[PDB]
Antibody, heavy 221, light 213 residues
């Protein structure tokens, strides 16, 4: 039951510093080398730093991309590894992971924590419910929509009926335009389920501390 | 550095088909490892030390190679194998990954279901007007969308977004959003989204007229 959990991610400005944490469960932390890696969106994974075990004094090693800007450290008593970042730039934007290794292999990773380095303003989304003009061409089925517009940074969390509606859903990757994102999502249900049962689009945007619910209303009787 | 190059960058295979992907290295390494990545989520160790499957990896997977050439093979493609596969050398600093092979699955061609949505009254209140069109559950991924406003093709103002292959049915979906001012939206009546897909010579056409709702 090895567990690794990164926290600390968030939006920061170019030149800022941010410290990431990785708390671990289910192995004897101090006996393993620990690493940070990252993946810019749409790009391959990148190894960026390793800290050896207390005894080595081989110390720490870094990718050149971060060397002399980032510092890896460990607290064995806390079973935790850290990445102190400084002098951040736009190309440091990525999901950051901590990993344990054995021999040549990185065996266990965390879930990732997301860091955005940007000068764009944090902006809460506008959330628009999309009511059908017609049932689907086959029967029998209807597609509803939710449009989420004008937010920054990623991510939003969208669900339908607080997550009870999971089947038949399509949530599209966000697209960036003029420092603002828009995303949409559709749900398809049997015509006998809607509008007789309520369907609601729920959008969380943690960066702007907002959570918006929007019921889909039928156009007519 | 040891530079890792994977071919092909992207591939598709029908279910039961034999899959091979390669990882070339700029200079010899002693062992190669492989990670499976679904949906840009946390990578899973797949194969370590060239040929050993990690715990729970199905026996249809195999790793081989030596020197500067490594491969991963799936004897019989399955739906659950849809992922991006990275090779990884951990023998010399900096530790490096290849650029991935994105592995998709083939299914039977499927026509999209097309749905169009007017600007919401809430959006109109704010001075803006988005018309939305979904092209859902189609295969193969290639697809054209066109917008017509009172019969006239509209190019500027459209933003498109495609999902990754669906995990329950192996189809793709696409959203197309036409953003206009409320004023221009209010200057016209017929809003039409047309989908052109290989499953038919005729486009799938969905419309509404603003002045009806």
């Amino acid at each position: 039951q090895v567990q690794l959990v990164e926290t600390g991610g968030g939006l920061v400005r170019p030149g800022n510093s941010l410290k990431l944490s990785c708390v671990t469960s289910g192995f004897t932390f101090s006996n393993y080398r620990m690493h940070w890696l990252r993946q810019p969106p749409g790009k391959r994974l990148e190894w960026i730093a390793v800290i050896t075990v207390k005894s080595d004094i081989y110390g720490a090693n870094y990718a050149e991309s971060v060397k002399g800007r980032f510092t890896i450290s460990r607290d064995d008593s806390k079973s935790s590894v850290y990445l102190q970042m400084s002098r951040l730039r736009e190309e440091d934007t990525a999901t950051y992971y901590c990993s344990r290794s054995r021999g040549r292999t990185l065996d266990y990773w965390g879930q990732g924590t997301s860091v955005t380095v940007s000068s764009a303003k944090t902006t809460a989304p506008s959330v628009y419910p999309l009511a059908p003009v017609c049932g689907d061409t086959t029967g029998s089925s209807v597609t509803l929509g939710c449009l989420v517009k004008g937010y920054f940074p990623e991510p939003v969390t969208l669900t339908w009926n607080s997550g009870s509606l999971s089947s038949g859903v399509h949530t599209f990757p966000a697209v960036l335009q003029s420092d603002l994102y828009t995303l949409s999502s559709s749900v398809t249900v049997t015509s006998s389920t809607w509008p007789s049962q309520s369907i609601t689009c729920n959008v969380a945007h943690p960066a702007s501390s907002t959570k918006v619910d929007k019921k889909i209303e039928p156009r007519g009787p | 550095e040891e530079v890792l190059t994977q071919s092909p960058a992207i591939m598709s295979a029908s279910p039961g088909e034999k899959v091979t992907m390669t990882c070339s290295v700029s200079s010899s390494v002693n062992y190669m490892h492989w990670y499976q990545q679904k949906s840009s989520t946390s990578p899973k160790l797949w194969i370590y030390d060239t040929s050993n499957l990690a715990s729970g990896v199905p026996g249809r997977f195999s790793g081989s190679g030596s020197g500067i050439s490594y491969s991963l093979t799936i004897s019989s493609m399955e739906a659950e194998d849809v992922a991006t596969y990275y090779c990884f050398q951990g023998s010399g600093y900096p530790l490096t990954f290849g650029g991935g092979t994105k592995l998709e699955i083939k299914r039977a061609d499927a026509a999209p279901t097309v749905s169009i949505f007017p600007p919401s009254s809430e959006q109109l209140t704010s001075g803006g007007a988005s018309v939305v069109c979904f092209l859902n559950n189609f295969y193969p991924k290639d697809i054209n969308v066109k917008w017509k406003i009172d019969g006239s093709e509209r190019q500027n103002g459209v933003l498109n977004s495609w999902t990754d292959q669906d995990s329950k049915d192996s189809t793709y979906s696409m959203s197309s959003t036409l953003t206009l001012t409320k004023d221009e939206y209010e200057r016209h009546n017929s809003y039409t989204c047309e989908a052109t897909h290989k499953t038919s010579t005729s486009p799938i056409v969905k419309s509404f007229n603003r002045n009806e709702c």
